Scaffold this motif. Structure first.
Motif, PDB file in Angstrom:
ATOM      1  N   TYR A 111       0.843  -1.220   0.000  1.00  0.00           N
ATOM      2  CA  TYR A 111       0.000   0.000   0.000  1.00  0.00           C
ATOM      3  C   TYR A 111       0.866   1.254   0.000  1.00  0.00           C
ATOM      4  N   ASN A 112       0.334   2.328  -0.586  1.00  0.00           N
ATOM      5  CA  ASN A 112       0.928   3.675  -0.391  1.00  0.00           C
ATOM      6  C   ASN A 112       0.124   4.510   0.620  1.00  0.00           C
ATOM      7  N   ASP A 113       0.853   5.368   1.321  1.00  0.00           N
ATOM      8  CA  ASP A 113       0.336   6.561   2.018  1.00  0.00           C
ATOM      9  C   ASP A 113      -0.672   6.115   3.082  1.00  0.00           C
ATOM     10  N   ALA A 114      -0.245   5.270   4.006  1.00  0.00           N
ATOM     11  CA  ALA A 114      -1.134   4.758   5.086  1.00  0.00           C
ATOM     12  C   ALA A 114      -1.056   5.664   6.323  1.00  0.00           C
ATOM     13  N   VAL A 115      -2.091   5.594   7.149  1.00  0.00           N
ATOM     14  CA  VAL A 115      -2.207   6.287   8.455  1.00  0.00           C
ATOM     15  C   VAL A 115      -2.397   5.204   9.510  1.00  0.00           C
ATOM     16  N   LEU A 116      -1.676   5.334  10.611  1.00  0.00           N
ATOM     17  CA  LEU A 116      -1.870   4.547  11.862  1.00  0.00           C
ATOM     18  C   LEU A 116      -2.587   5.422  12.874  1.00  0.00           C
ATOM     19  N   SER A 117      -3.754   4.981  13.366  1.00  0.00           N
ATOM     20  CA  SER A 117      -4.602   5.763  14.302  1.00  0.00           C
ATOM     21  C   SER A 117      -4.822   4.984  15.604  1.00  0.00           C
ATOM     22  N   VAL A 118      -4.621   5.664  16.742  1.00  0.00           N
ATOM     23  CA  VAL A 118      -4.635   5.087  18.109  1.00  0.00           C
ATOM     24  C   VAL A 118      -5.575   5.923  18.951  1.00  0.00           C
ATOM     25  N   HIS A 119      -6.340   5.275  19.815  1.00  0.00           N
ATOM     26  CA  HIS A 119      -7.158   5.997  20.800  1.00  0.00           C
ATOM     27  C   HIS A 119      -7.156   5.219  22.113  1.00  0.00           C
ATOM     28  N   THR A 120      -6.375   5.699  23.079  1.00  0.00           N
ATOM     29  CA  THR A 120      -6.298   5.108  24.445  1.00  0.00           C
ATOM     30  C   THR A 120      -6.258   6.268  25.433  1.00  0.00           C
ATOM     31  N   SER A 121      -6.314   5.971  26.738  1.00  0.00           N
ATOM     32  CA  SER A 121      -5.993   6.950  27.834  1.00  0.00           C
ATOM     33  C   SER A 121      -4.609   7.604  27.643  1.00  0.00           C
ATOM     34  N   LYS A 122      -3.605   6.851  27.223  1.00  0.00           N
ATOM     35  CA  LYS A 122      -2.209   7.341  27.072  1.00  0.00           C
ATOM     36  C   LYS A 122      -2.107   8.196  25.792  1.00  0.00           C
ATOM     37  N   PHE A 123      -2.778   7.779  24.714  1.00  0.00           N
ATOM     38  CA  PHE A 123      -2.657   8.418  23.371  1.00  0.00           C
ATOM     39  C   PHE A 123      -4.046   8.665  22.778  1.00  0.00           C
ATOM     40  N   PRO A 124      -4.779   9.688  23.262  1.00  0.00           N
ATOM     41  CA  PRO A 124      -6.075  10.073  22.709  1.00  0.00           C
ATOM     42  C   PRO A 124      -5.964  10.775  21.350  1.00  0.00           C
ATOM     43  N   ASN A 125      -6.823  10.382  20.382  1.00  0.00           N
ATOM     44  CA  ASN A 125      -6.940  11.120  19.104  1.00  0.00           C
ATOM     45  C   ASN A 125      -5.572  11.225  18.424  1.00  0.00           C
ATOM     46  N   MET A 126      -4.806  10.141  18.388  1.00  0.00           N
ATOM     47  CA  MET A 126      -3.460  10.103  17.778  1.00  0.00           C
ATOM     48  C   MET A 126      -3.563   9.572  16.346  1.00  0.00           C
ATOM     49  N   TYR A 127      -2.956  10.276  15.383  1.00  0.00           N
ATOM     50  CA  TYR A 127      -2.908   9.894  13.961  1.00  0.00           C
ATOM     51  C   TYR A 127      -1.471  10.043  13.483  1.00  0.00           C
ATOM     52  N   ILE A 128      -0.963   9.079  12.728  1.00  0.00           N
ATOM     53  CA  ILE A 128       0.454   9.073  12.219  1.00  0.00           C
ATOM     54  C   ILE A 128       0.468   8.731  10.749  1.00  0.00           C
ATOM     55  N   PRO A 129       1.000   9.614   9.855  1.00  0.00           N
ATOM     56  CA  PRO A 129       1.230   9.268   8.463  1.00  0.00           C
ATOM     57  C   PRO A 129       2.503   8.410   8.381  1.00  0.00           C
ATOM     58  N   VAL A 130       2.340   7.117   8.127  1.00  0.00           N
ATOM     59  CA  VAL A 130       3.489   6.161   8.187  1.00  0.00           C
ATOM     60  C   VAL A 130       4.090   5.977   6.806  1.00  0.00           C
ATOM     61  N   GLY A 131       3.442   6.442   5.742  1.00  0.00           N
ATOM     62  CA  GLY A 131       3.948   6.315   4.374  1.00  0.00           C
ATOM     63  C   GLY A 131       3.707   4.945   3.806  1.00  0.00           C
ATOM     64  N   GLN A 132       4.673   4.450   3.034  1.00  0.00           N
ATOM     65  CA  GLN A 132       4.564   3.185   2.271  1.00  0.00           C
ATOM     66  C   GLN A 132       4.500   1.976   3.223  1.00  0.00           C
ATOM     67  N   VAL A 133       3.605   1.047   2.909  1.00  0.00           N
ATOM     68  CA  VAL A 133       3.426  -0.210   3.679  1.00  0.00           C
ATOM     69  C   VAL A 133       3.788  -1.425   2.806  1.00  0.00           C
ATOM     70  N   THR A 134       4.783  -2.204   3.252  1.00  0.00           N
ATOM     71  CA  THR A 134       5.330  -3.391   2.552  1.00  0.00           C
ATOM     72  C   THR A 134       4.592  -4.652   3.038  1.00  0.00           C
ATOM     73  N   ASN A 135       4.229  -5.531   2.118  1.00  0.00           N
ATOM     74  CA  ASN A 135       3.878  -6.925   2.472  1.00  0.00           C
ATOM     75  C   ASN A 135       5.178  -7.592   2.889  1.00  0.00           C
ATOM     76  N   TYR A 136       5.463  -7.564   4.172  1.00  0.00           N
ATOM     77  CA  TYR A 136       6.721  -8.069   4.784  1.00  0.00           C
ATOM     78  C   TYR A 136       6.693  -9.603   4.869  1.00  0.00           C
ATOM     79  N   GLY A 137       5.554 -10.160   5.280  1.00  0.00           N
ATOM     80  CA  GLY A 137       5.319 -11.612   5.377  1.00  0.00           C
ATOM     81  C   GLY A 137       5.719 -12.168   6.719  1.00  0.00           C
ATOM     82  N   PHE A 138       6.834 -12.911   6.770  1.00  0.00           N
ATOM     83  CA  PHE A 138       7.288 -13.569   8.016  1.00  0.00           C
ATOM     84  C   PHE A 138       7.958 -12.553   8.957  1.00  0.00           C
TER      85      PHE A 138
END
Ligand SMILES: Oc1cnc(-c2ccccc2)nc1
Length: 182
Positions: A98-125
């Motif tokens: 995939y291209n241009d992915a976002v990682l989004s987290v919502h916890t007590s420690k990290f509320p409303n957190m969004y991260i542009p992580v960029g390119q995502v590889t099918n890594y496999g093992f």
């Protein structure tokens, strides 16, 4: 900030809860009906806390591929009085990069957190905490403790949930449409 963050926010606002087990607080993605996912290392038991409310677990299945290798996804059915919006049509049908992915987290420690992580590889093992694991996605972002269960999206697709990191890279378990056929 742009249409990737728009899609991610829409998923977070309606399809996440905060799950707590004896192993920590996790972002938990609701997929449809009372069915959600969480990393297998959360060690879901008979009872879980959902937004700090005691909830009975009706079923929990730690997924493995047909080679009997860990996939690090647990599917949980919750004894909750409300259904999730059905988002199964946003799940990929095959393993992919995939291209241009976002990682989004919502916890007590990290509320409303969004991260542009960029390119995502099918890594496999991946040897994840000593456990051979398959169907791993990789992003070149230095993810930290507290992000497990975080949702990985592109525009229009929910592609995985964060399960680990090596200090320079982050790793997610794939979500596939075939996991949630009923
Ligand atoms: O005040 C700070 C705390 N934590 C992070 C953070 C950075 C990468 C991944 C997760 C979290 N940033 C700033």
């Amino acid at each position: 900030m742009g249409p990737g963050f728009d899609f991610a926010q829409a998923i977070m606002k309606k399809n996440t809860v905060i799950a707590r087990t004896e192993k920590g607080e996790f972002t938990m993605l609701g997929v449809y009906d009372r069915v959600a996912v969480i990393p297998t290392h959360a060690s879901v038991g008979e009872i879980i806390y959902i937004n700090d409310v005691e909830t009975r677990v009706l079923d929990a299945c730690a997924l493995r591929d047909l080679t009997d290798t860990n996939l690090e996804i647990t599917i949980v059915k919750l004894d909750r009085n409300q259904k999730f919006r059905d988002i199964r049509h946003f799940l990929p049908r095959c393993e992919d990069d995939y291209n241009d992915a976002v990682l989004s987290v919502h916890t007590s420690k990290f509320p409303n957190m969004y991260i542009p992580v960029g390119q995502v590889t099918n890594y496999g093992f991946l040897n994840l905490g000593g456990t051979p694991t398959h169907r791993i996605l990789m992003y070149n972002f230095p993810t930290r403790a507290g992000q497990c269960g975080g949702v990985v999206t592109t525009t229009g697709k929910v592609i995985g949930i964060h399960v680990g990191g090596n200090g320079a890279q982050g790793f997610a378990a794939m979500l596939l449409h075939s996991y949630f056929t009923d």
